[PDB]
């Protein structure tokens, strides 16, 4: 996986913990990969990607990082934190994907942390073409005398996803001589984590089924994205079918549903673990329903990749 430059944002491998009380209530061995407890600013999955993204930015001698997402994007917040830490400027192109006017979505949560990180906020109506909108802003910013480095939506490029290809080795090492996995459940947004884990776990764990619970798209729209990135990563590294469930995001991206919210309550009351309304909560709702519908190929132990997002809870409260 090396030969690609990488910074040290995590260092120690993130915890893999048994969930006894959730396993109790579900009657099935459930494990959790705690990528939410990464050391930088309340954590998240994007640290793994930014280790490669910002390492590439320093090689190209950038002084400014530019990315995009929702107002309450964890990715934007993690990007801003890393930038501040390294002395790099940060420009954010943000949108309101749900059209709310609630003070806490507009000003609290991840968006509040952006003000603290001194992030140059740029508002747009819709991210209809993010790659081309970032490119525009990057020209404007470099015209102002800066050296910008564009980071894609969720940092979900072939290089970005290398963080989660590497992440598979951690899982393989932590599970070995302790637990024999059967299934792995992960949230599938911009496909960065899901494609990354697909390539890695194909080689490092043969008899495991990777399930991608979508948060924004249907199977028809998500399949082409996860396949393409998988074949980009495999080609980049000189090296299996994609499995997706799309029932567990109700009205769309960035809107809470009853199943996802109750999943949040479940893992907080039983395990003291904090999920989020947008990603992990919905991803967990699929996991619970997967056992319920016996949608997994067998009744063996399941691993949930906690990708973070907990700071969103403070923005979505009380409602949106």
By the criterion CB under 6 A, which residues form the site for ligand DCS?
44-45, 69, 73-75, 153-154, 156, 187-194, 276, 279-280, 307-309
Least Å from the CB of residue 63 to a copy of itself: 14
By CB under 8 A, tell whether 21 contacts a copy of itself. Answer: yes
Least Å from the CB of residue 14 to a copy of itself: 9
Residue 181 or 215 having the CB closest to ligand DCS = 215
Q: Which stretch binds a copy of itself (CB under 8 A): 114-122, 125-133, 164-172, 221-229?
A: 114-122
Q: Assign 298 to helix, strand or coil.
A: coil
Instruction: Name the DSSP class of 213.
Output: E
Q: Which two tokens stand for residue 240?
A: 């299996």
Q: In whole angstroms, how far apart are CA 268 and each of 21, 221, 274, 298? A: 11, 32, 6, 27
Kind plus residue range of the DSSP H or E element containing 47: helix 46-59
Instruction: Name the DSSP class of 13.
Output: P
258, with CB counted inside 10 A (0-12, 13-18, 19+), is exposed
By CB under 8 A, tell whether 109 contacts a copy of itself. Answer: yes
By CB under 8 A, tell whether 87 contacts a copy of itself. Answer: yes
Using CB under 8 A, pick the residue from 45, 72, 108, 190 that binds a copy of itself: 108
Q: What angle do CA 12, 18, 20 make, to 5 degrees?
A: 150
Residue 32 or 191 having the CB closest to ligand DCS = 191
Complete DSSP assignment for 51-92: HHHHHHHHHTT-SEEEEEEETT-HHHHHHHHHHHHHT-EEEE
State the catalytic residue, choosing from 73, 157, 188, 216: 73
By CB under 8 A, tell whether 15 contacts a copy of itself. Answer: yes
Binding mask 118-147 for a copy of itself (x = CB under 8 A): x-----------------------------
Q: Which two tokens stand for residue 24?
A: 């109790």
| Torsion over CA: 157, 158, 159, 164 (sign) | positive
Q: Which own/partner contact pairs does 59-62 have at CB distance under 8 Å and 24+ positions apart?
A: 59/5, 60/147, 60/149, 61/147, 62/88, 62/147, 62/148, 62/149
303 binds, options a copy of itself, ligand DCS, none, Cβ within 5 to 8 A by partner type: none
Place of tokens 């190209």: 60
By CB under 8 A, tell whether 85 contacts a copy of itself. Answer: yes
By CB under 8 A, tell whether 269 contacts a copy of itself. Answer: yes
Complete DSSP assignment for 112-181: HHHHHTT-EEEE-S--SSHHHHHHHHHHHHHHTT--EEE--GGG-STTTTHHHHHHHHHHHHHHTTT---
**73 noted as active-site residue:** yes
188 binds, options a copy of itself, ligand DCS, none, Cβ within 5 to 8 A by partner type: ligand DCS
Binding mask 273-312 for a copy of itself (x = CB under 8 A): xx-----------------------------------xx-
Size of the residue set binding a copy of itself (CB under 8 A): 45
Question: Which amino acids are annotated catalytic?
Answer: 73
Residues in touch with a copy of itself (CB under 8 A): 11-12, 15, 17, 21, 34, 37, 39-43, 80-85, 87, 103-104, 107-109, 112-113, 116-118, 264-265, 268-274, 310-311, 313-315, 317-318
């Amino acid at each position: 996986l090396t030969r690609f430059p990488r910074l040290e944002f995590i260092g120690a491998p993130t915890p893999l913990e048994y969930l006894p009380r959730l396993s109790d209530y579900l009657g099935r061995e459930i494990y959790i990969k705690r990528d939410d407890v990464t050391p930088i600013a309340m954590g998240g999955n994007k640290l793994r990607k930014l280790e490669f993204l910002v390492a590439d930015a320093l090689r190209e001698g950038a002084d400014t990082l530019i990315t995009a997402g929702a107002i309450q994007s964890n990715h934007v917040r993690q990007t801003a934190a890393v930038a501040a830490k390294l002395g790099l400027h940060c420009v954010a192109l943000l949108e309101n994907p749900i059209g709310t006017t609630a003070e806490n979505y507009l000003t609290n949560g991840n968006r509040l942390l952006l003000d603290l990180f001194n992030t140059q906020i740029e508002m747009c109506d819709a991210l209809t073409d993010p790659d081309a909108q970032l490119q525009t802003l990057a020209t404007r910013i470099e015209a102002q005398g800066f050296r910008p480095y564009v980071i894609p939506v969720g940092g979900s490029s072939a290089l970005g996803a290398m963080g989660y290809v590497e992440s598979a080795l951690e899982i393989a090492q932590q599970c070995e001589e302790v637990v024999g996995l059967s299934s792995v459940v992960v949230a599938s947004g911009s496909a960065g984590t899901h494609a990354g884990l697909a390539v890695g776990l194909e080689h490092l764990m043969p008899d495991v089924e990777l399930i991608g619970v979508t948060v924004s798209r249907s199977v028809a729209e998500q399949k082409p994205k996860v396949i393409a990135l998988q074949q980009a990563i495999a080609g980049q590294l000189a090296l299996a079918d994609i499995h997706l469930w799309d029932d567990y995001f109700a009205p769309g991206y960035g809107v809470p549903n009853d199943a996802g919210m109750e999943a949040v309550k479940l893992l907080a009351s039983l395990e003291g673990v904090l999920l989020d309304p947008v990603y992990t909560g919905k991803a967990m709702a699929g996991l619970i329903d997967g056992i319920s519908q016996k949608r997994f190929n067998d009744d063996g132990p399941i691993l949930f990749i906690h990708t973070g997002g907990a700071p969103a809870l403070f923005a979505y409260h009380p409602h949106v």
